[PDB]
Amino acid sequence: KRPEDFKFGKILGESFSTVVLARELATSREYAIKILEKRHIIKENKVPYVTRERDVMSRLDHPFFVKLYFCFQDDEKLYFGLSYAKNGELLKYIRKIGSFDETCTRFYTAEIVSALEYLHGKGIIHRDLKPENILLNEDMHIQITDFGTAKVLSARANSFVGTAQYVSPELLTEKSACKSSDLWALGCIIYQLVAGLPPFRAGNEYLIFQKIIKLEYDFPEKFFPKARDLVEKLLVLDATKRLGCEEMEGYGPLKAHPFFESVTWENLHQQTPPKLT
Numbered sequence: 268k269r270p271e272d273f274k275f276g277k278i279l280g281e282s283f284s285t286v287v288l289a290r291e292l293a294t295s296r297e298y299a300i301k302i303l304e305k306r307h308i309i310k311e312n313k314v315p316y317v318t319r320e321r322d323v324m325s326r327l328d329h330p331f332f333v334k335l336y337f338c339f340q341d342d343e344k345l346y347f348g349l350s351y352a353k354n355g356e357l358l359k360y361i362r363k364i365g366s367f368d369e370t371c372t373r374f375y376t377a378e379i380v381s382a383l384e385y386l387h388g389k390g391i392i393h394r395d396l397k398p399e400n401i402l403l404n405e406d407m408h409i410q411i412t413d414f415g416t417a418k419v420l421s422a423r424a425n426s427f428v429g430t431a432q433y434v435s436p437e438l439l440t441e442k443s444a445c446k447s448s449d450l451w452a453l454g455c456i457i458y459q460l461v462a463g464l465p466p467f468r469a470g471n472e473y474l475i476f477q478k479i480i481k482l483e484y485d486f487p488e489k490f491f492p493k494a495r496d497l498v499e500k501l502l503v504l505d506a507t508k509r510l511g512c513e514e515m516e517g518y519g520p521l522k523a524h525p526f527f528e529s530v531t532w533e534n535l536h537q538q539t540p541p542k543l544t
């Protein structure tokens with residue numbers, strides 16, 4: 268595919284990339300085109316993010332994931348053609364409506380779990396999962412994105428990445444990520460859906476790091492009991508003891524948690540999501 272094939276429309280967002288809403292003229296398909304300046308990627312020292320983003324997304328084929336449909340270049344630019352998620356970031360919705368009812372919390376948590384199971388199945392660790400990175404398409408189904416910081420396992424691995432609010436303990440104290448590290452993030456995300464704020468809150472990132480390793484957070488009073496129960500089984504310092512990790516026997520037990528007991532798992536992507544709170 269060539270640049271000339273697209274209208275480059277509204278700039279959807281702008282650090283070392285600009286994401287534009289593009290329309291392929293002949294098919295009228297919309298894509299989110301990520302535009303990168305080769306030279307600026309070099310000077311900011313972000314080539315690893317780009318190559319890694321490409322490698323990982325090229326392995327993904329699942330409804331709950333943004334897909335990499337095409338890549339092209341010209342003399343000064345790199346163009347990534349991605350799935351366009353028209354409804355933007357999960358984060359926007361939590362800020363907008365405050366916190367989700369249990370029906371919505373349950374459904375979206377289910378889709379994220381379903382997504383993680385697939386990702387981890389292919390031996391990939393996201394490492395930076397968060398509401399900003401969980402997008403909603405036109406059908407209001409999730410589409411995860413931002414794989415630049417991901418890791419392909421050969422287990423565990425070594426790297427220095429994350430977002431303070433969702434970073435797992437093991438990343439901070441062993442400088443190593445595993446699949447269970449994503450389950451920690453999931454725990455933080457469920458909490459935030461229900462409470463309307465992330466669980467670990469402090470004066471700065473280092474202080475946030477301290478909360479995390481201290482397991483220092485609180486459930487407000489209105490927290491759905493079964494969700495509280497699930498969150499406690501995910502926010503566990505010992506990475507080998509989180510619900511859904513390999514030592515805990517995997518996703519079977521995670522999906523069997525009472526919080527999910529009503530969920531119809533196999534065709535989540537084909538169900539009309541619940542009206543958002």
Ligand SMILES: CN1CCC[C@H]1CCn1cc(C2=C(c3c[nH]c4ccccc34)C(=O)NC2=O)c2ccccc21
Pocket residue numbers: 279280281282286299301333349350351352353355356399400402412413414
């Ligand atoms: C740079 N950003 C703006 C705010 C947060 C961050 C966006 C997170 N994000 C959103 C992405 C995507 C999309 C976006 C939809 N609305 C946006 C607004 C700003 C930036 C991106 C998007 C999308 O349609 N498909 C996507 O894959 C995306 C694709 C690759 C890496 C990170 C991404």
Ligand SMILES: *SCCCC(=O)N1CCN(Cc2cccc3ccccc23)CC1
Pocket residue numbers: 305306308309314317318321338339340345346
């Ligand atoms: S769109 C087709 C795929 C492009 C692609 O995979 N890559 C790999 C990452 N680089 C690194 C890079 C970036 C900027 C300038 C470069 C000059 C020479 C060699 C690599 C460069 C290229 C695009």
Ligand SMILES: [Cl-]
Pocket residue numbers: 354355356359
């Ligand atoms: Cl948005």
Ligand SMILES: [Cl-]
Pocket residue numbers: 359
């Ligand atoms: Cl909006």
